[PDB]
Amino acid sequence: MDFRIGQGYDVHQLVPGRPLIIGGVTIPYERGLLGHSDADVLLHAITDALFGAAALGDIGRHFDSRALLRECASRVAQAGFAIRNVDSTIIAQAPKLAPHIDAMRANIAADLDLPLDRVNVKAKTNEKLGYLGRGEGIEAQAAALVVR
Amino acid sequence: MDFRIGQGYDVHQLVPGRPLIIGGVTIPYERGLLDADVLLHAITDALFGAAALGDIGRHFSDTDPRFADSRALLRECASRVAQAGFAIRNVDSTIIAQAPKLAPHIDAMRANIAADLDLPLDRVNVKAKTNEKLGYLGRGEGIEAQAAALVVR
Amino acid sequence: MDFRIGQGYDVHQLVPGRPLIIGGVTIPYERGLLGHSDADVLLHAITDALFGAAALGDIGRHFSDTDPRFKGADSRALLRECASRVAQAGFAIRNVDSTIIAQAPKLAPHIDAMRANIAADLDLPLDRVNVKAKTNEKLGYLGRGEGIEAQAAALVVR
Ligand SMILES: Nc1ccnc(=O)[nH]1
Numbered sequence: 136m137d138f139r140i141g142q143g144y145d146v147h148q149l150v151p152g153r154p155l156i157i158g159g160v161t162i163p164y165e166r167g168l169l170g171h172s173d174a175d176v177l178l179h180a181i182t183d184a185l186f187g188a189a190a191l192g193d194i195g196r197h198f199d200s201r202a203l204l205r206e207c208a209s210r211v212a213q214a215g216f217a218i219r220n221v222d223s224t225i226i227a228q229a230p231k232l233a234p235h236i237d238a239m240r241a242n243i244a245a246d247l248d249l250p251l252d253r254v255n256v257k258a259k260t261n262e263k264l265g266y267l268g269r270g271e272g273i274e275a276q277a278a279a280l281v282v283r
Numbered sequence: 284m285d286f287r288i289g290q291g292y293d294v295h296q297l298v299p300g301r302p303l304i305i306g307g308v309t310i311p312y313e314r315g316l317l318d319a320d321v322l323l324h325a326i327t328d329a330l331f332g333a334a335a336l337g338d339i340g341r342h343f344s345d346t347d348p349r350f351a352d353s354r355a356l357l358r359e360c361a362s363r364v365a366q367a368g369f370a371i372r373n374v375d376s377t378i379i380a381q382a383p384k385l386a387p388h389i390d391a392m393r394a395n396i397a398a399d400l401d402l403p404l405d406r407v408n409v410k411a412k413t414n415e416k417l418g419y420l421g422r423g424e425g426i427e428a429q430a431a432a433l434v435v436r
Numbered sequence: 437m438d439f440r441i442g443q444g445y446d447v448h449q450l451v452p453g454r455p456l457i458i459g460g461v462t463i464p465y466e467r468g469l470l471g472h473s474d475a476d477v478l479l480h481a482i483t484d485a486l487f488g489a490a491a492l493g494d495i496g497r498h499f500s501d502t503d504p505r506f507k508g509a510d511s512r513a514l515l516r517e518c519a520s521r522v523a524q525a526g527f528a529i530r531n532v533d534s535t536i537i538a539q540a541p542k543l544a545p546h547i548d549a550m551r552a553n554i555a556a557d558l559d560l561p562l563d564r565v566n567v568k569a570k571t572n573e574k575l576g577y578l579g580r581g582e583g584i585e586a587q588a589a590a591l592v593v594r
């Protein structure tokens with residue numbers, strides 16, 4: 136059986152008067168993510184991880200972020216792949232993410248047509264180090280397993 | 284069969300006044316990590332990720348009276364992964380530290396992790412990188428670990 | 437069905453007077469990457485991921501930072517030897533995915549060429565090799581164009 140892995144990376148700046156949307160979840164915060172779309176850093180990293188696993192290139196080559204994640208899933212199936220699992224990490228000094236995670240995971244599992252038990256979202260601070268630890272941006276990392 | 288991957292990340296500040304412990308190994312150095320075992324946390328996180336059990340923060344709170352050191356948490360993690368129905372297939376990882384030299388300590392760390400995970404030794408790998416004097420890591424202000432894990436149900 | 441995964445990281449400083457070589461492609465640019473070898477950040481990260489998947493240590497173990505035979509070393513040749521030691525360990529490579537993070541130059545026009553180089557060195561079809569390119573959204577030393585980073589994941593099978 137023809138397994139493939141992919142890995143994704145994303146980061147966006149924290150700016151004033153933007154809403155903070157991570158994993159499809161709007162979170163109350165003084166700042167939000169700057170990007171050309173809704174800047175959903177978690178969903179972007181997963182998207183890239185999925186594109187990588189199917190050897191379809193990346194987010195820049197192909198293109199709200201949930202519609203984009205859905206399209207990615209469609210193009211992955213187009214290529215003949217099925218998604219086995221997604222895992223990920225959000226790196227954010229603030230605000231607290233713990234309470235929003237199950238929701239993010241539910242958003243992701245819906246968009247990808249996966250059962251909840253095949254999707255995971257983890258959260259880390261940056262221990263006050265670098266631009267992340269200063270709350271100047273937020274990073275996400277993702278890993279995806281697919282099979283042909 | 285029913286394979287899953289997981290990935291882990293971790294970082295801790297590196298300052299005078301503490302012992303340096305990485306992958307269960309104490310390392311002579313003029314600094315230490317605020318036990319703070321980056322390598323073992325990233326790997327634990329990777330294992331929960333693969334199992335889709337959340338993360339180390341949900342399982343072992345900076346609160347709970349039940350918790351101990353990073354190898355104990357790794358064992359408990361492994362046991363919880365087993366109960367969800369997953370056997371661990373392999374682990375790989377990278378420590379990014381500008382200093383001190385990690386090469387001599389690598390087989391020791393791999394030995395701890397394989398013991399803790401109940402794996403054949405040839406299923407655990409640990410790599411080491413500098414950050415080429417770039418950023419907080421390259422200035423020695425902290426140390427990062429990265430981990431990946433394959434599991435099967 | 438004895439599958440293994442690996443992951444890899446690399447960074448190098450971007451400096452005046454050096455060739456810019458990434459994924460084995462020489463990119464026209466006024467700066468290049470600094471290292472002992474040709475400092476190909478992408479191939480190094482992929483080499484790490486392969487060594488890691490096979491549990492063979494890492495690129496420092498196999499091709500020391502200090503052995504003068506690796507001065508100006510072609511990193512494609514290092515990747516090929518890596519693939520060779522992975523197969524000799526009994527693994528076949530199934531796929532590689534990877535990411536480059538760089539403020540500049542534009543990497544999109546060279547990405548296919550990099551994928552081609554990697555697929556040849558690993559003896560894979562193009563459709564099992566993927567290369568992605570990111571900016572760091574202007575954050576940190578990567579945003580300041582001080583270095584270029586790469587990440588890789590590889591799946592192999594015994
Ligand atoms: N920002 C956060 C980092 C880690 N854990 C959280 O719950 N929130």
Ligand SMILES: Nc1ccnc(=O)[nH]1
Nearest residue numbers: 380384385386412413
């Ligand atoms: N800190 C280290 C960086 C790179 N190699 C080592 O062996 N140790």
Ligand SMILES: Nc1ccnc(=O)[nH]1
Nearest residue numbers: 538542543544570571
């Ligand atoms: N340096 C680059 C970053 C992102 N995309 C590119 O095409 N190039």
Ligand SMILES: [Cl-]
Nearest residue numbers: 571572574579
């Ligand atoms: Cl940038």
Ligand SMILES: [Mg+2]
Nearest residue numbers: 274292427585
């Ligand atoms: Mg990083």
Ligand SMILES: [Zn+2]
Nearest residue numbers: 145175176179
């Ligand atoms: Zn993004």
Ligand SMILES: [Zn+2]
Nearest residue numbers: 293320321324
């Ligand atoms: Zn930690």
Ligand SMILES: [Zn+2]
Nearest residue numbers: 446476477480
């Ligand atoms: Zn390198």
